[PDB]
């Protein structure tokens, strides 16, 4: 049964609620982004409207095979009328096609649903700057002060450096990057750009990327593995036995892999900076974990919420235990008392 934090009051609208069957009263099912926990349930057999971004739409049509009529894509940053309720989609700074949704209720209430987001100061000079927001449905993935991690631009620096070093030292080495969903495309796009290469990948991964409205994408990616010295592989596969396996397949064309596992937070964020990172090493295969996040750090979340001064906050992540819910409330209360709302 659909939880109350997936429903929007005073509408027939639900958000990321595709795994419960038909929801009684729901005229419209919104989808913030193409990540499987959020879309779990959709298929070709959906015959209710879906509102989402253009890019999420492309993924729906081509990867799930939903029928063009039931996909309502909306532009971003444009006031849009939807069953006689004004809504806006805003860029969520998460993965490609990910959005936050502003709902303007008939009664005068204004609700922001952040979907998954990495809060940023550019969101403070968006349309959000123009009016008061009463309710906030918030991505609380990292709502605890231990969760620090570097900027995306810092991490892309490290990466472009590591890879471009090794390749210039040994020009018969492979750069691999791990992946399992959309997100974090900048990791491999940046490395390939520095190496003068296209990124090579499976057919199913190429198919996914071809849905994302990336400019010049035909010049950046390929399904010809042999022609490419940045390869993408499944994240399950990024390990010694599975990389060995892969190093066989290339047929005596490379004598050393240099992988990257972009990850979220791990406990080695608590003691080690990004400039002082190391790989695990079993022979000629070297595996970096690098903490490229597409969610808000604690500080980023705190700043956004303290600027928004929402009258009420409804968490969407880690809501499954009483302990987590309780911890989160205490932080929300601190933030409110500090900031004077
Ligand atoms: Ni996500």
Curated annotation (Swiss-Prot):
Induction: During mitosis. The mRNA encoding this protein contains an internal ribosome entry site (IRES) in its 5'-UTR. This 5'-UTR generally suppresses translation while specifically promoting expression during mitosis, when cap-dependent translation may be impaired. GO terms for cellular component: fibrillar center; nucleoplasm. Binds constitutively to TP53BP1. Binds CDC27, which is itself a component of the anaphase promoting complex (APC). Binds PIAS1. May be required for DNA interstrand cross-link repair. Also required for checkpoint mediated cell cycle arrest in early prophase in response to mitotic spindle poisons. Possesses beta-lactamase activity, catalyzing the hydrolysis of penicillin G and nitrocefin. Exhibits no activity towards other beta-lactam antibiotic classes including cephalosporins (cefotaxime) and carbapenems (imipenem). One of its GO terms (molecular function) is 5'-3' DNA exonuclease activity. Changing residue 295 to A: Impaired nuclear focus formation, reduced interaction with PIAS and increased sensitivity to cisplatin. It is found in: Nucleus. It comes from the Eukaryota. Coiled coil: none annotated. Belongs to the DNA repair metallo-beta-lactamase (DRMBL) family. One of its GO terms (biological process) is cell division. The gene is DCLRE1A. The keyword Methyltransferase does not apply. Signal peptide: none annotated. This is DNA cross-link repair 1A protein. Expressed in brain, heart, kidney, liver, pancreas, placenta and skeletal muscle. Keywords: Cell cycle, Cell division, DNA damage, DNA repair, Hydrolase, Isopeptide bond, Metal-binding, Mitosis, Nucleus, Phosphoprotein, Ubl conjugation, Zinc, Zinc-finger.
């Amino acid at each position: 049964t659909c939880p109350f934090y997936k429903k929007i009051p005073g509408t027939g609208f639900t958000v990321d609620a595709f795994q419960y069957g038909v929801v009684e009263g729901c005229t419209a099912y919104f989808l913030t982004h193409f990540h499987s926990d959020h879309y779990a349930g959709l298929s070709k057999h959906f015959t209710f409207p879906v509102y989402c971004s253009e890019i999420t739409g492309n993924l729906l049509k081509n990867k799930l095979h939903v029928q063009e009529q039931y996909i309502h894509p909306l532009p971003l940053d444009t006031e849009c009328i939807v069953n006689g309720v004004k809504v806006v989609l805003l860029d969520a700074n998460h993965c490609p096609g990910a959005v936050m949704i502003l709902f303007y209720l008939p009664n005068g209430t204004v609700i922001l649903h952040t979907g998954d987001f990495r809060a940023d100061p550019s969101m403070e000079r968006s349309l959000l700057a123009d009016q008061k927001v009463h309710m906030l449905y918030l991505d609380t993935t990292y709502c605890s002060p231990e969760y620090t991690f570097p900027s995306q631009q810092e991490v892309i620096r490290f990466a472009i450096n590591t890879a471009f070093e090794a390749v210039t030292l040994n020009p018969h080495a492979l750069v691999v990057c791990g992946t399992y969903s959309i997100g974090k495309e900048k990791v491999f796009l940046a490395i390939a750009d520095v190496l003068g290469s296209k990124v090579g990948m499976s057919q199913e991964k190429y198919k996914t990327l071809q849905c994302l409205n990336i400019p010049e994408i035909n010049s950046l990616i390929t399904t010809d593995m042999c022609s490419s010295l940045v390869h993408l592989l499944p994240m399950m596969q990024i390990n010694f036995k599975g990389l060995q396996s892969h190093l066989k397949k290339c047929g005596g064309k490379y004598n050393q892999i240099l992988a990257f596992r972009p990850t979220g937070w791990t406990h080695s964020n608590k003691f080690t900076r990004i400039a002082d990172v190391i790989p695990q090493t079993k022979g000629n295969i070297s595996i970096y974990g690098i903490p490229y996040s597409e969610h808000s750090s604690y500080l980023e979340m705190k700043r956004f919420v303290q600027w928004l001064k929402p009258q009420k906050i409804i968490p969407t992540v880690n809501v499954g235990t009483w302990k987590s819910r309780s911890t989160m409330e205490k932080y929300f209360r601190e933030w409110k008392l500090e900031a004077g709302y």
